């Protein structure tokens, strides 16, 4: 009964509201501010010990410890200041593709092609790290996992769904469905009340944790989006896709703000991140280096060269002091 | 100096972790990793059964050599996002059913499409392929009632199974655009003693010898 037609009418009337809402661009608003100038960073620490390629890393809230995962089947916690190894956890399955660090610092999580998320307890009276819980129920490979709290974790999987788990019980509470392609990334808001995910249908969605509902949908990109990250304020986020293009979205205006592209870049974007104040945007590419963009002027400010292979993971510490970068040549570098 | 009593003890702990990471890493370099692929019910179960959700790993030993096979079937997601995790395998095992040339769910052309994609993949530009042709004793009986012209309209030949089997093997080997640095070994699966694992041992030993020669520059 014209059910398909009503959806088309709703889709059209939505885009007119956005067009009527748009009256200015950031290019003309931000044209009268001083650029950041040249930005040069030097490598300070090089961490070695992984026998295979690093697929993920995550900083600690204390801004000293750092967990990283590699395909050789090991999780290593590092001491950044002294380049010491604090722990080394052997994994049951070597096909690990994501890892996370608990905000309290008592747990770490990992997952991959085994369709299971494992949680390890670091503070044990026996003096060794042991598996605390295994969460099963996803029908596709785990793409991302983030500790929402010491007892809650949110996980995105390759079966086009996201779930929220209760670690103590072992059962998932709410399920977030609505994506068409595989979900590749997620990012938690600084207030830990909302989160955003990007999928292979070239769309991003904003979800509410408590209600389990989708608030907004964004469809600015053209290809698969692999990275996503909130602004430090929490009212915007940036996405990186396979068309060698990064884009900035606004939640309040519910549309796009800026595009970060170059004529000499053809390689896809692997990871994206923001600085402490949000003026700088860090992006890693497949052409073996990283670019520092000016998030307000959309012009390049510097490059981070020194990796011999694909830059797979990238993270900025909580106080904005250092940037950690991993790659497929089995090395970790810290820049300052 | 500048290190305290507790800092010196932490450094000594880190050296012990380095030693453990070195010894187990060297141990894993003496294994041989294999990848199993196929088109649905191609007979992969029979191959695994001879040596007795997610990914399945099988270990077995043959003549002082350790093998590991990974079965990546059953994962209901596109392989473009996780196939690069298997770059560096010694060889790839592909299973094909000879008796599926008339069943449709035409499915033989579906397996040929999968073979073409994996053979000419950018990641797998140098790994060798060991091909298994299953259901030999069923294809011979089915060829006496259903002509091969159903699957291959351009096939002009006899109805003998030896003639038909040679034609099918030729079509699979001609999809390889990397005629150099990539070689295809073909075998018709049989249940006579352990000839199936004997062939895999012969093919992998040939792969390793040719890999060593390339490093020295001799080949």
């Amino acid at each position: 009964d014209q059910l398909r037609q009503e959806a088309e009418q709703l889709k059209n009337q939505i885009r007119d509201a956005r067009k009527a809402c748009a009256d200015a661009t950031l290019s003309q608003i931000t044209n009268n501010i001083d650029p950041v100038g040249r930005i040069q960073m030097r490598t300070r620490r090089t961490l070695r010990g992984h026998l295979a390629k690093i697929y993920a890393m995550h900083w600690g809230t204390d801004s000293r410890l750092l967990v990283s995962a590699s395909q050789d089947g090991k999780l290593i916690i590092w001491d950044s200041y002294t380049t010491n190894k604090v722990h080394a956890i052997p994994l049951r399955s070597s096909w690990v593709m994501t890892c996370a660090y608990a905000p309290s610092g008592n747990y770490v999580a990992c997952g991959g092609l085994d369709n299971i998320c494992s949680i390890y307890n670091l503070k044990t009276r026996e003096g060794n790290v042991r598996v605390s819980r295994e969460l099963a129920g996803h029908t596709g490979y785990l793409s991302c996992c983030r500790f929402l709290d010491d007892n809650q974790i949110v996980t995105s999987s390759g079966d086009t769904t996201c779930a929220l788990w209760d670690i103590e019980t072992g059962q998932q509470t709410t399920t977030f469905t609505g994506h068409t392609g595989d979900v590749m990334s997620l990012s938690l808001a600084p207030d830990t009340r909302l989160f955003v995910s990007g999928a292979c249908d070239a769309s991003a969605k904003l979800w509410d944790v408590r209600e389990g509902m989708c608030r907004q949908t964004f469809t600015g990109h053209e290809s698969d989006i692999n990275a996503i990250c909130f602004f430090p304020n929490g009212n915007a986020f940036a996405t990186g896709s396979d068309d060698a293009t990064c884009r900035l979205f606004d939640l309040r205006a519910d549309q796009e703000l800026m595009t970060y592209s170059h004529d000499n870049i053809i390689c896809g974007i692997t990871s994206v991140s923001f600085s402490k104040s949000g003026r700088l945007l860090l992006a890693g590419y497949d052409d073996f280096n990283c670019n520092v963009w000016d998030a307000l002027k959309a012009d390049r400010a510097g490059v981070l060269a020194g990796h011999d292979n694909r830059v797979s993971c990238l993270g900025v510490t909580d106080d904005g002091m250092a940037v950690a970068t991993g790659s497929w040549d089995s090395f970790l570098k810290i820049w300052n | 100096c500048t290190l305290s009593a507790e800092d010196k003890a932490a450094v000594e702990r880190s050296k012990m972790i380095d030693r453990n990471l070195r010894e187990d890493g060297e141990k894993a370099a003496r294994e041989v990793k294999l990848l199993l692929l196929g088109a649905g019910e191609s007979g992969k179960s029979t191959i695994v059964k001879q040596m007795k959700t997610g990914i399945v790993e099988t270990h077995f030993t043959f003549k002082d050599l350790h093998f590991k096979m990974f079965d990546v079937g059953g994962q209901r997601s596109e392989r473009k996002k996780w196939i690069h995790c298997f770059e560096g395998v010694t060889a790839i095992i592909f299973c094909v059913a000879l008796s599926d040339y008339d069943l449709v769910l035409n499915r033989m052309h579906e397996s040929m499409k999968l073979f073409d994609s994996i053979c000419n993949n950018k990641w797998f530009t140098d790994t060798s392929i060991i091909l298994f042709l299953n259901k030999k004793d069923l294809f011979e009986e089915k060829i006496k009632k259903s002509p091969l012209t159903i699957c291959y309209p351009e096939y002009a030949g006899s109805n003998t199974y030896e003639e038909a089997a040679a034609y099918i093997q030729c079509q699979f080997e001609d999809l390889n655009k990397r005629k150099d640095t990539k070689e295809i070994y073909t075998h018709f699966t049989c249940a006579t003693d352990t000839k199936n694992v004997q062939f895999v041992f012969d093919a992998v030993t040939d792969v390793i010898i040719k890999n060593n020669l390339k490093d020295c520059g001799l080949f």
Partner: single-chain antibody
Amino acid sequence: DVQLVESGGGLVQPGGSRKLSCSASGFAFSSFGMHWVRQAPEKGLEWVAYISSGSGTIYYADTVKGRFTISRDDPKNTLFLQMTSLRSEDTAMYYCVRSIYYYGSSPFDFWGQGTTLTVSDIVMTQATSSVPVTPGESVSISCRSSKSLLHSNGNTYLYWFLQRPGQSPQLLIYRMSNLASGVPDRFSGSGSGTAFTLTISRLEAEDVGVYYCMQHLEYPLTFGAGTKLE
């Protein structure tokens, strides 16, 4: 459960030799360093020897060098100490202490039960030998150091222990500020440089005992005399 059991504490004629053993069960014995600490019948604690993980490092007290020998057997989870040329001053009670060293750990967490043997530097000063007090009142314990315990990395190495009557010592505060797990949140540590203070809020019948402060800065480990509360 974590347990350390000692054996070999008989009576020894002067100039003799004896063997002491420490059997550990309930934890990964190979990842922990071990200390030997003895206590005279009326005096306080004193450190004897130390052996690390992997047996790579061995340390001795200056008064037992060339006389004692410490070693461990990982497969059997046993720590044993060989004593030679015993004298009348080696009449004490020997403790087995476990210790692990990495960023953010708590050394000296678990002590053994003790075995008795009868044969027949930074000076740490405690303010008062005894303190009489009634429950429900705040009491402060302070001890002084000859050399500054603050390192260049920003860590102050002072530890606090509690000796309950007829019981092995228990860790309360490590690195002068951190509170050990399982300790009620009414013990507070403070101080800077050479003077440190331990504050007890809402004292009850469980705080009666002897308090010791130890430094973990240099090669030998030194304890204080000990403050008694009534």
